[PDB]
Design a protein around this nucleic acid. Structure first.
Length: 54
DNA sequence: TTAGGGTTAGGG
DNA sequence: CCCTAACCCTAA
């Protein structure tokens, strides 16, 4: 069952991009306690947030 | 391991 | 329902 992204998970990805730059998906995933999210999931999520103005 | 296009399921 | 966010596929 697919799981929608929480606003806390989205803020984690936002700070991880700030602290490490886009494309550093495996580095961002390790800097935050992401449970059930792969680095590819983080990259797809970032594309969604960019498109949704976030 | 990431980028970018393609695919699908679940919620608005 | 069915659009789209959450997925998958794969070159490099």
């Amino acid at each position: 069952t697919r799981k929608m992204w929480s606003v806390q998970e989205s803020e984690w990805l936002k700070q991880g991009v700030v602290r490490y730059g886009v494309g550093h998906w495996e580095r961002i995933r390790s800097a935050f306690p992401f449970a059930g999210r792969t680095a590819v999931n983080l990259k797809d999520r970032w594309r969604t947030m960019v498109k949704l103005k976030m």
